Ligand binder design. Structure first.
Ligand code: FES
Ligand SMILES: [K+]
Ligand SMILES: [K+]
Ligand SMILES: [K+]
Ligand SMILES: [Mg+2]
Ligand SMILES: [Mg+2]
Ligand SMILES: [Mg+2]
Ligand SMILES: [Mg+2]
Ligand SMILES: [Mg+2]
Ligand SMILES: [Mg+2]
Ligand SMILES: [Mg+2]
Ligand SMILES: [Mg+2]
Ligand SMILES: [Mg+2]
Ligand SMILES: [Zn+2]
Lengths: 11, 162, 82, 175, 169, 43, 222, 95, 38
RNA sequence: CCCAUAGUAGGCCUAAAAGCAGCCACCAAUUAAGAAAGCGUUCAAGCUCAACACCCACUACCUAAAAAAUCCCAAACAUAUAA
């Protein structure tokens, strides 16, 4: 349901 | 609580905040239904100015007063505790809590006058040169009128004006 | 000494051309387009008094703006004597 | 600073009241008048134009000229010299929704509406409100005979107003 | 020898004064002060129709517009803010502002739960039906003081660098 | 310096008098006695 | 979100032709050749006339007794006609023109020789009588300022009130009398002649119930 | 408007780095809004305000470089906007 | 200072403060607004 | 406490009336702002308020004084179970 969080720029 | 540290490191001032351990309310209050700590612990109408162990829990390290919203007290208890804290400061019952003094400022020697139940500031009132007749006598206020509802074990009620 | 220029008084010219629109010396009067070339919402525009709060839908932004304007008027009336 | 004022096209003069303001703020009155006349040469004289003057710290002025006032547009469209005194009661002029739409098309080129990118429906509604404020009633459709009859009635009403003004002037002279 | 009606408050007889003192109003006193007792909650009023319309508008915008981005609305001048809004409208980026109180339930009960921390403080939405991220980014860069708080493009939450790279994609 | 014009307890201006707690108690006691008298005369 | 609320229906009220207060004469047109005794009972006790609203929504209520003369009438009239809105507000009197003759002897006269000549006229006012009543397309918050100014400048105690405020005051007094926890009351003691208190009380106290003392009315007495 | 009245004349540059996904950047963003207010920026046109929105996850920071060459660092992890503004004003007055 | 019984703020710049046991309406933009409680 | 664009200087009078000397209307743009509530300008600019937004200020909601003349006037006390 809920959209996944934005991946970290470091990763 | 929270503390703020300022360090001038290499001509570059750094301001930082850190979280220190904070006290928590003692478990199992006698009156959980109370809306303030005083009524939760059944201290309503059961404390005076000399209860430093109670007054010190609502004051700043330098002798100031904490916000009512932060403390959680009601307006009446907040005002009563503020008056009691003022009286305790005037009576010198909080030696650790003293006003902050700027560096290099040493207070001059002043006469020492022991006092208690001081309602007004010492340097605000004027001498009663004319007391007036008995039916219009100028009474000297003693204590705080806000504490008139405190429990009075003695038959004679508290005299708030001498 | 400085006033608006002369205005057209011919009813036929007023009803067939946009004399008010015509403002440039070189430009001529623009003839009025027919109903086919004019949109429907133009003829659906309100021409009478502003719609009342009861007429406006309770959930409509027009209703809420009207209520806000009424509240502003009430505040102004209250503060006028103050 | 910003000076916003209504200046008639091609009628800029170095006299008051705009001249003193430009002199106080450092704007060359003659230069402003010349530039305004040059930029409004193609526009018929007597047309009121909003003008925004931006004054930079080095005492140089930049002028922006907007579209003519909707009041003037409606007056010229309805052939009206002076608007209604008691607006909403006396009908000074009569215009059509076609005239309103044309004036909305012309006025939509103004910077104020262009920046907001508001619909021509909103522009038409604004013009309708302006006409209501002026006192010019707006009808959906108007015929030549109806307009002529309205013009005759308005001429009679203006004659009555002139008689009332003469009576008031006589009363003031008696006072 | 004063009369029954006098300009000053006439001195009463001592017995009458004692009677007045005795027959004084004694207000009722509750055993426990009401403020020191639990207060049952009061049901709030129904949801405002304006709030419902705002919720419907927010749902419609999030359902229709593809490019959705959150930007902290810095206190720019009105003229410059209107100019930037017009520049965005040139590329159909319709800036929208909705109250956080109304917006929070929609995010909590919708797919945008992870976007909640981005809406603290003054915030606006640079939303467009079609992805115009490059134009949005350059318009954001035109004002260095005005920041870009990431956002979510096509139901995919991205950071500011993700928005930067999406245009390059 | 505190003078009452004329006689203290008579005249336009008089020395003020104030009700005491024991006076109130005595009046209340007498009122209770008279109320009991009313009750016993009631029958 | 700001909670907008409906505006009141003040616009339903219609303003009469003459909104401003009419001029009050110093003396009646027909002179009074019959001097009258100093009847002080006309400002003593509760008001039995003009105690309710008739055509207005706000009023100036008198909480005490006194006499209004031409100076007071002029002050009220000028203040109200200057601070009022003719288009939205209208005001009317509830007190008559000064009619009671008042006699004054010459300066330096001794006692004796006869009653003095008539000097001026006053209007007796009791506690509870409305003085000026206002209404129209307005609210009490828009009139309270100058109404309170006039009440303060009045010779007796007065207050600007409305229908709601007056009803609330009366209900509060009734509630106080109902829930008073003191078993002894002035009215009961006076009626029963307990402790022989009627030897020092007044015959009018049997109706005043200890709430009135001369021209002074104590709202705190229950 | 104490900050606007004091001005940014001795301030060469202000930079604010914060991660919007974090929850401790509230005070930092409030400080950024206060500094980026039109009056404060118009007081000193030379001073520039820079915003660094990153998903790194580092604690929010504020770096102010003054005209004297000195720097002021304020970490918003456990600092409030009012305290940061007070420190900023004090350092502006000092420089 | 001017002695008054009912202290009022003649302007928004005026602020009330209790010093030496008496109230004072101080002001800086308009120093004539300064008032002392009687 | 923070901010406050715009049809438009609404028409009507006036040499001039621009929200704020008078008369009438009192609509409408922007999600958000009165054809203007209180200052200001000869008139304009220039200033707060009612706006939007951020966001728990969780306002007390009682009003208010004083001065004479030989020298103020018992001394004192807020704490031990109403007598
Ligand atoms: S202690 Fe109980 S209400 Fe405050
Ligand atoms: K006497
Ligand atoms: K009085
Ligand atoms: K005017
Ligand atoms: Mg007698
Ligand atoms: Mg004597
Ligand atoms: Mg005009
Ligand atoms: Mg005007
Ligand atoms: Mg003016
Ligand atoms: Mg609007
Ligand atoms: Mg306007
Ligand atoms: Mg202005
Ligand atoms: Mg405001
Ligand atoms: Zn002042």
């Amino acid at each position: 349901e809920a959209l996944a969080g934005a991946p970290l720029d470091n990763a | 609580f929270r503390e703020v540290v300022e360090t001038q490191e290499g001509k570059t001032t750094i301001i930082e905040g850190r979280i220190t351990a904070t006290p928590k309310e003692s478990p199992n209050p006698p009156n959980p239904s109370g809306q303030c700590p005083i009524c939760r612990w059944n201290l309503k109408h059961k404390y005076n100015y000399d209860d430093v162990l109670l007054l010190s829990q609502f004051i700043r390290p330098h002798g100031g007063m904490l916000p009512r919203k932060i403390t959680g007290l009601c307006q009446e208890e907040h005002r009563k505790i503020e008056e009691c804290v003022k009286m305790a400061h005037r009576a010198g019952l909080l030696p650790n809590h003293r006003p902050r003094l700027p560096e290099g400022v040493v207070p001059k020697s002043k006469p020492q006058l022991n006092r208690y139940l001081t309602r007004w500031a010492p340097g605000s009132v004027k001498p009663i040169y004319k007391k007036g007749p008995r039916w219009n006598r100028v009474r000297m206020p003693v204590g705080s009128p806000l504490l008139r509802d405190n429990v009075c074990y003695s038959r004679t009620p508290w005299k708030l004006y001498h | 000494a400085l006033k608006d220029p002369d205005v057209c008084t011919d009813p036929v010219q007023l009803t067939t051309y946009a004399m008010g629109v015509n403002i440039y010396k070189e430009g001529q009067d623009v003839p009025l387009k027919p109903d086919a070339e004019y949109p429907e919402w133009l003829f659906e525009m309100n021409l009478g008094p502003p719609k009342t709060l009861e007429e406006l839908d309770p959930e409509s932004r027009e209703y809420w703006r009207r209520l806000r304007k009424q509240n502003i008027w009430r505040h102004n009336r209250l503060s006028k004597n103050k | 600073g910003v000076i916003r004022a209504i200046v008639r096209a091609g009628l800029a003069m170095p006299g008051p009241p705009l001249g003193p303001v430009l002199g106080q703020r450092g704007v060359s009155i003659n230069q402003f008048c010349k530039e305004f006349n040059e930029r409004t040469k193609d526009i018929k004289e007597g047309i009121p134009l909003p003008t925004k003057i931006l004054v930079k710290p080095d005492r140089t002025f930049e002028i922006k000229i907007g579209q003519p006032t909707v009041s003037y547009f409606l007056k010229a469209a309805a052939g009206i010299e002076k608007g209604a005194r008691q607006t909403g009661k006396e009908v000074a002029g009569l215009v059509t929704l076609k005239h309103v739409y044309e004036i909305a098309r012309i006025k939509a080129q103004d910077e104020a509406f262009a920046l907001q990118d508001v619909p021509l429906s909103s522009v038409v509604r604004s013009i309708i409100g302006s006409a209501r404020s002026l006192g010019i009633r707006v009808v959906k459709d108007l015929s030549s005979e109806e307009l002529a009859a309205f013009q005759k009635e308005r001429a009679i009403f203006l004659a009555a107003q002139k008689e009332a003004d003469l009576a008031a002037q006589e009363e003031a002279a008696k006072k | 020898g004063s009369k029954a009606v006098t300009r000053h408050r006439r001195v009463m007889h001592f017995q009458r004064q004692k009677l007045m003192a005795v027959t004084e109003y004694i207000p009722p006193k509750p055993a426990i002060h009401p403020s020191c007792l639990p207060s049952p909650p009061s049901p709030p009023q129904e949801e405002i129709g304006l709030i419902r319309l705002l919720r419907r508008e927010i749902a419609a915008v999030f359902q229709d517009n593809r490019m959705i981005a959150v930007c902290q609305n810095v206190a720019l001048s009105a003229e410059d803010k209107l100019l930037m809004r017009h520049q965005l409208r040139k590329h159909k980026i319709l800036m929208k502002v909705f109250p956080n109180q109304v917006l929070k339930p929609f995010l909590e009960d919708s797919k945008y739960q992870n976007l909640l921390p981005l809406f603290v403080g003054h915030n606006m939405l640079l939303v467009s039906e079609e992805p115009k991220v490059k134009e949005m980014v350059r318009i954001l860069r035109t004002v260095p003081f005005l920041p870009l708080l990431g956002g979510c493009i096509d139901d995919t939450i991205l950071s500011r660098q993700g928005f930067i790279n999406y245009s390059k994609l | 310096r505190g003078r009452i014009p004329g006689r203290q307890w008579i005249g336009k201006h008089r020395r003020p008098r104030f009700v005491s707690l024991r006076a109130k108690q005595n009046m209340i006691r007498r009122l209770e006695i008279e109320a009991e008298n009313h009750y016993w005369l009631s029958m | 979100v700001k909670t907008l609320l409906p505006v009141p229906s003040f616009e339903d009220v219609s303003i009469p032709e003459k909104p401003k207060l009419r001029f009050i004469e110093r003396a009646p047109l027909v002179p009074k050749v019959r001097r009258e005794p100093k009847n002080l009972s006309d400002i003593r006790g509760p008001s039995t006339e003009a105690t309710e609203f008739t055509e207005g929504n706000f009023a100036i209520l008198a909480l005490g007794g006194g006499y209004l003369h031409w100076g007071h009438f002029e002050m009220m009239r000028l203040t109200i006609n200057r601070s009022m809105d003719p288009k939205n507000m209208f005001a009317i009197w509830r007190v008559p023109a000064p009619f009671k003759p008042i006699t004054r002897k010459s300066v330096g006269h001794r006692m004796g020789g006869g009653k003095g000549a008539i000097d001026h006229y006053v209007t007796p006012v009791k506690a509870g009588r409305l003085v000026v009543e206002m209404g129209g397309r307005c609210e009490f918050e828009e009139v309270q300022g100058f109404l309170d100014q006039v009440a303060h400048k009045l010779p007796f105690a007065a207050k600007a009130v409305s229908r709601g405020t007056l009803e609330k005051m009366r209900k509060d007094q009734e509630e106080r009398e109902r829930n008073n926890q003191n078993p002894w009351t002035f009215e009961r003691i006076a009626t029963a002649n307990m402790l022989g208190i009627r030897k020092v009380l007044s015959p009018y106290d049997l109706t005043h119930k200890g709430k009135y003392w001369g021209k002074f009315y104590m709202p705190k007495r229950v | 408007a104490a900050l606007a009245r004091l001005g940014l004349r001795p301030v060469k540059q202000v930079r604010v780095q914060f991660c919007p996904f974090e929850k401790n950047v509230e005070s930092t963003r409030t400080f950024l809004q206060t500094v980026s207010s039109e009056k404060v920026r118009s007081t000193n046109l030379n001073c520039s305000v820079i915003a660094d929105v990153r998903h790194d996850g580092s604690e929010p920071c504020v770096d102010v470089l003054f005209g004297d060459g000195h720097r002021l660092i304020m970490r918003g992890a456990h600092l409030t906007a009012l305290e940061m503004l007070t420190a900023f004003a004090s350092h502006i007055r000092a420089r | 200072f001017k002695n008054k019984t009912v202290l009022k703020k003649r302007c928004k710049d005026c602020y009330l403060v209790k010093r030496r046991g008496r109230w004072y309406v101080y002001c800086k933009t308009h120093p004539r607004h300064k008032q002392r409680q009687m």
